[PDB]
């Protein structure tokens, strides 16, 4: 089937398993319409589109449809980032997995200047339902990758680095967030969705909301934090396998640039520690039955593309 990026229509896909049903994919057309960036949109509920003139009764119809896991089509006023009003002929429908249970919601927007009626409304409704069907077929091939590991090991940074080629400043702990990549693999594009999760132990009861139907896990530890490495065996491997006994795991050693960093080596020496070496990482990967061991740096990007390329190959090949 076609891939998601070839659908030149306004739409988003949300994950209703996560708290508050956040957007996990947004089309380029949607970004253009709404004036928001992908990093501003993913991981958030789509209600940010609403504003002063939006009919709240219409919004409640959408809420009701989602709660009942049924499709609905409505028209309501929405707003771009800069505050420009538009009418949104909006269609929502659940996407079910092979077992028939709801996995995602698909939402399609047809923007205009007016509330359309009669013939024009009928035509609009027919168009967006067709679009939703096309997205459903394409979304069946979205690869779900979930990234787990101790707090501050660099999970978020490697996702931001891979998707924007930037490096983030201030450390801000994650709850959940999502990223999207379109990756060429053997000459064909693949849609990869990346679920970022919290390393904090106090998020243990929430974290597994991200786990169902995962295609591949990245378990991450920092090459310069032995505690994070030991937690791979004691915490992360057991947790992942408890929920997903059969899903491939890639073990990822992060912060590769710090392993040969003089200040870092000295600080570890003060702690009576040394960085984790490649053979040590590889041995841990073998111990936990990981399909690959990979090392990378979000900062320099060394090894970074290979992490996601191998994640996809673990699923497709
Ligand atoms: N030198 C270096 N520092 C990094 C690298 N990746 C992450 N960092 C640093 O590590 C800190 C933690 O990075 P995050 O990506 O936010 O950590 P996380 O694993 O997402 O943490 P949680 O969201 O709390 O689970 C960052 O603020 C950076 O200072 C890297 O590749 N090299
Ligand atoms: C797939 C998906 C797409 C959505 N797209 C829009 C949108 O285009 N515009 C909008 O106003 N609300 C959209 N929503 C609806 C809001 O996310 C939310 O369900 C609605 O505001 C009602 O819930 P609330 O009362 O908790 O806000 C979308 C919801 C989902 C599931
Ligand atoms: Cl919602
Ligand atoms: Cl570290
Ligand atoms: Cl490096
Ligand atoms: Mg994070």
């Amino acid at each position: 089937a076609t891939t998601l990026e070839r659908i030149e229509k306004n739409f988003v896909i949300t994950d209703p398993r996560l708290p508050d049903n956040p957007i996990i994919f947004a089309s380029d057309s949607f970004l253009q319409l709404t004036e928001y960036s992908r990093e501003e949109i993913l991981g958030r509920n789509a209600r940010f589109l609403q504003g002063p003139e939006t009919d709240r009764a219409t919004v409640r119809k959408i809420r009701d449809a989602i709660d009942n896991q049924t499709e609905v089509t409505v028209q309501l006023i929405n707003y771009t980032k800069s505050g420009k009003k538009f009418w949104n002929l909006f269609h929502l429908q659940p996407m079910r997995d092979q077992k028939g249970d709801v996995q995602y919601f698909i939402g399609v927007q047809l923007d205009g200047t007016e509330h359309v009626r009669d013939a024009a409304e009928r035509e609009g409704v027919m168009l967006i339902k067709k679009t939703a069907e096309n997205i459903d077929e394409a979304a069946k091939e979205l690869i779900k990758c979930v990234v787990v590991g101790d707090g501050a090991v660099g999970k978020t940074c490697l996702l931001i680095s891979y998707t924007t080629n930037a490096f983030p400043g201030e450390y801000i702990p994650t709850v959940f967030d999502n990223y999207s990549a379109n990756v060429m693999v053997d000459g064909k594009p693949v849609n990869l969705g990346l679920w970022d999760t919290a390393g904090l132990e106090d998020y243990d009861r929430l974290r597994p909301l991200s786990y169902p139907q995962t295609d591949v896990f990245l378990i991450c530890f920092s090459l310069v934090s032995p505690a994070s490495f030991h937690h791979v065996r004691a915490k992360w491997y057991p947790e992942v396998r408890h929920h997903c006994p059969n899903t491939p795991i890639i073990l990822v050693g992060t912060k590769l640039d710090l392993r040969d960093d003089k200040d870092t080596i000295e600080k570890l020496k003060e702690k009576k520690l040394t960085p984790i070496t490649y053979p040590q990482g590889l041995a841990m990967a073998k111990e936990i039955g990981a399909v690959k061991y990979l090392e990378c740096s979000a900062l320099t990007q060394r090894g970074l593309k290979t992490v996601f390329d191998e994640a996809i190959r673990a699923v497709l090949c």
Side-chain angles (χ1 to χ4, degrees), residues 1-169 171-317:
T2 193
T3 44
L4 287 163
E5 77 288 353
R6 295 181 175 184
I7 299 173
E8 298 172 41
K9 299 290 172 184
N10 306 310
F11 66 97
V12 299
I13 302 173
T14 67
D15 184 354
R17 291 189 161 95
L18 300 182
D20 208 25
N21 194 26
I23 297 168
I24 63 79
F25 182 94
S27 73
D28 280 1
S29 296
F30 180 94
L31 306 191
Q32 294 159 1
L33 164 65
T34 67
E35 307 171 9
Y36 289 98
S37 72
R38 193 161 274 114
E39 69 177 14
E40 287 173 319
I41 293 179
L42 302 188
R44 301 175 175 71
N45 189 282
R47 68 169 71 84
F48 59 80
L49 294 167
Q50 298 155 19
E53 296 189 21
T54 307
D55 186 334
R56 297 196 295 280
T58 306
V59 175
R60 284 185 293 280
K61 287 178 184 168
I62 294 167
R63 176 220 284 162
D64 290 344
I66 293 164
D67 290 347
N68 293 318
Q69 299 184 333
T70 57
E71 57 176 5
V72 74
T73 310
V74 296
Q75 295 185 63
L76 81 173
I77 293 160
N78 277 174
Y79 295 84
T80 70
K81 181 176 169 177
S82 65
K84 291 171 56 176
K85 163 186 169 174
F86 62 98
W87 272 92
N88 177 358
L89 175 52
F90 168 66
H91 178 71
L92 167 141
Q93 64 182 55
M95 182 192 334
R96 305 173 175 278
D97 57 24
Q98 295 184 7
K99 305 178 293 182
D101 309 337
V102 175
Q103 176 169 17
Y104 298 124
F105 284 92
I106 293 169
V108 181
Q109 300 86 10
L110 186 172
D111 56 294
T113 51
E114 292 288 330
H115 185 146
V116 294
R117 313 284 272 114
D118 302 317
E121 176 180 35
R122 188 183 64 246
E123 284 176 3
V125 172
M126 277 166 33
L127 281 184
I128 62 186
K129 280 179 178 182
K130 174 57 176 172
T131 295
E133 291 299 293
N134 288 340
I135 297 160
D136 177 288
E137 293 303 319
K140 288 179 176 177
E141 306 309 319
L142 177 68
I143 296 183
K144 175 171 181 178
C145 174
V146 177
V147 186
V148 303
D150 279 12
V153 300
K155 300 183 298 302
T156 296
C157 281
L158 68 89
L159 296 170
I160 291 176
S161 181
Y162 183 60
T163 59
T164 73
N165 289 326
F167 192 89
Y171 172 50
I172 299 170
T174 303
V175 182
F176 288 104
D177 199 359
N178 271 261
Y179 296 83
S180 301
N182 300 324
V183 185
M184 298 294 301
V185 179
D186 287 349
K188 300 203 170 202
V190 176
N191 303 127
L192 175 62
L194 293 149
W195 275 247
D196 195 8
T197 68
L200 196 87
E201 179 169 327
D202 278 334
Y203 272 117
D204 281 355
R205 294 181 174 195
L206 208 55
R207 195 182 304 106
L209 292 173
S210 66
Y211 295 172
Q213 307 300 301
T214 295
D215 294 305
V216 53
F217 280 92
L218 303 183
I219 295 178
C220 298
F221 70 94
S222 168
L223 289 164
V224 292
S225 172
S228 71
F229 183 61
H230 303 318
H231 295 154
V232 172
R233 187 58 186 84
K235 191 224 177 85
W236 300 111
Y237 167 56
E239 177 169 300
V240 168
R241 283 282 174 256
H242 182 248
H243 295 273
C244 304
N246 303 129
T247 305
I249 293 170
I250 294 180
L251 183 64
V252 181
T254 60
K255 307 194 184 174
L256 172 66
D257 60 284
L258 296 182
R259 180 159 67 199
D260 288 349
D261 179 67
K262 193 188 186 204
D263 287 351
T264 303
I265 295 169
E266 176 168 9
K267 213 59 167 281
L268 280 168
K269 173 66 175 181
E270 293 165 11
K271 296 173 186 168
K272 310 188 169 175
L273 301 170
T274 57
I276 306 299
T277 64
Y278 184 97
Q280 288 175 328
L282 185 68
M284 176 71 75
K286 182 175 177 174
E287 176 177 343
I288 70 169
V291 302
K292 297 288 300 178
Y293 174 60
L294 298 171
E295 297 183 336
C296 70
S297 171
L299 180 60
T300 67
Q301 307 196 306
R302 180 150 156 247
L304 191 60
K305 289 187 203 297
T306 296
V307 168
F308 301 100
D309 194 84
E310 293 293 336
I312 292 167
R313 295 180 176 272
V315 179
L316 295 188
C317 306

